[PDB]
Amino acid sequence: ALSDRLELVSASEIRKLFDIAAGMKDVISLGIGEPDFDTPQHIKEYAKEALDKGLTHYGPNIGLLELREAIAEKLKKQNGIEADPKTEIMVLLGANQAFLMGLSAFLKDGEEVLIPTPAFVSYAPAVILAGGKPVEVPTYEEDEFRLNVDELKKYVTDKTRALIINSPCNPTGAVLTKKDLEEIADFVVEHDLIVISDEVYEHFIYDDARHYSIASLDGMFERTITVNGFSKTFAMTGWRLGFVAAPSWIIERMVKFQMYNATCPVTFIQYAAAKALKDERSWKAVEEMRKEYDRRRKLVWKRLNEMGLPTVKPKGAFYIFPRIRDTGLTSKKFSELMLKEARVAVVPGSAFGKAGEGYVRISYATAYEKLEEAMDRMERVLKERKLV
């Protein structure tokens, strides 16, 4: 029963870190997994307008047609994904819902789900809740944390049914290249898996990174659940609005699940988001947020490497995953040390899976000036403790 599955999901480390940052005040948090920016004013105005229009009643379980149609245009133009808004696109209460509900559309007892790690915290638990078995597949610092298909091959079994990829990746900042995805696509077809692609950080890419969607590749739409949303893109985490594009058989099953879950997303919020997707100011806003993230990104990368922590320059999202294993401490000891002595909160890498151990996640979705001081604080402690 779900209760048994829930008991199997272990308590969150990020959770434990919050409650420990609570009794402290002088702490600069680098463990924040959301934009520090507020929602663009024009999006707020569209929401107000929707309220004035009285869009306060139930909407379809699949979401507002107008939004689904707006999503179809976005998926096609930006991601090369051709999806029917009437049957293949579903709006959700945040993209987070897509994992539990998407997996529940097909996952059977004991079936395995490959999860490249370090990975987003919701993956493994969603697999366990759906009735499956999470199988962590390590990604390496040497590959700039880009999933290597040769690693995937070590973990496949007759029970493997799905694969969850996340690019740009939380917590590494790794961006899968077109060829990475092409090889991954072949592997998925070879073992007849369903692949869930988490693309919420798509617009926050840097250097020569470019966002490709696996579902756009030849023969992939039939076996891919593309997950995305407005939380990171438009700084709308508190608005709880995400979506998926998948074959209609999967969509039908997710809407049925929704009928006995959250029912439907917020009506006036969907209206705001549909209008936002067609508003030029939305793209201007995203671009300026991307530019600021990039500025902070270069700061933390330089600082971390120069203070003595070998750190891969992330090409996407707003996280950096410095190596702390050489200090001789575990990811937890490191975080515990930084919090009490540097008054800086960083998430231990182990919270993102076994392969995360030896690292720590730092989010640069915080004021540049706070980042500057957080870096100085960490470096001082590293120097005083002779850890570097």
Added chain:
Amino acid sequence: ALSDRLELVSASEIRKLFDIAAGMKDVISLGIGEPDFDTPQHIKEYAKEALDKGLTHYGPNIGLLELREAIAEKLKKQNGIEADPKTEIMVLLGANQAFLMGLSAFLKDGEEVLIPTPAFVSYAPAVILAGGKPVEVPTYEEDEFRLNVDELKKYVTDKTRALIINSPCNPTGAVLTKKDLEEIADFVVEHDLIVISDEVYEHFIYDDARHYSIASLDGMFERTITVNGFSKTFAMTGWRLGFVAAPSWIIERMVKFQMYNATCPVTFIQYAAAKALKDERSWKAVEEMRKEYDRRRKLVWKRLNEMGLPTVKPKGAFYIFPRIRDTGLTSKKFSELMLKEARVAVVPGSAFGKAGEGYVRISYATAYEKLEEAMDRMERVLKERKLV
């Protein structure tokens, strides 16, 4: 696995009825399961205010503390329920989430959940999805559809772990009296069950009906999940905001579930509801809505009985459950006939359980004028077809 449980849930009849009203245009729908009223303007203004204050980021999985504190006050004053906002109250994306997540905090494999019927459509599927077995407990029109402990005693087994109660009841409009609840409480305690009390229609009570909460009864809070929300009370169905009050051990397991589900409710929306609870204009609006519902309620009750369909006078919610079995037609055939010839949509009682067969649900959450016309159309065909 969840996918297996999902396949066990049948396709919704209400769903089948919408798509069949779609290709038709002269139809008055009496199948509306939500308020026809708009959300009170001042609540809309509070939401707009929250947007201006930038309450657009993630909030706690359990919900904003300010809203939980406002709900604690509401539960104490209005329901006589003493609950700690910090650990015993959780905000959700609609009250609908409470059933799947609430049952998942404890229900084991094959464990039974007594469900009084005619019942709300989300009850049995939530039990199935949680991993248990739904056991229908009929309620009778001669009892004004008030749940009878005589019936519960016949359906309990050693496998029974929970009981779901709904007063005011959707679809019957029945309201459990204080003594009913006291007797139900005894039964729940005797069989060591957890009772989930769905009180979303609490404020729409009529005649001498008074709303009591089972969790307020002696020693009941420890084994009760009180489910409520803002969807019906304030006309906020499209806002997706409900809540539960329960023992902290249940609440803890529910927030953990949420972490891998919707994460947290809409931030600025929770701010709006917290303000609304303390605003006299909100309660003034509830009173006006209840007054209008009552006016419509008396019309439909009188019209239904006089046209030849024996109908129990509902004391709560905004639904009326006429008996149609005397016409010789099944609930589905009666709904088919009314849609085809009267151009009036009513939902077959069978969609709410076996005990619902022989009845039909009519919602009076629609304009008085539309109700008058629908009654006229229905009576015309009942007479034309010699069904009365």
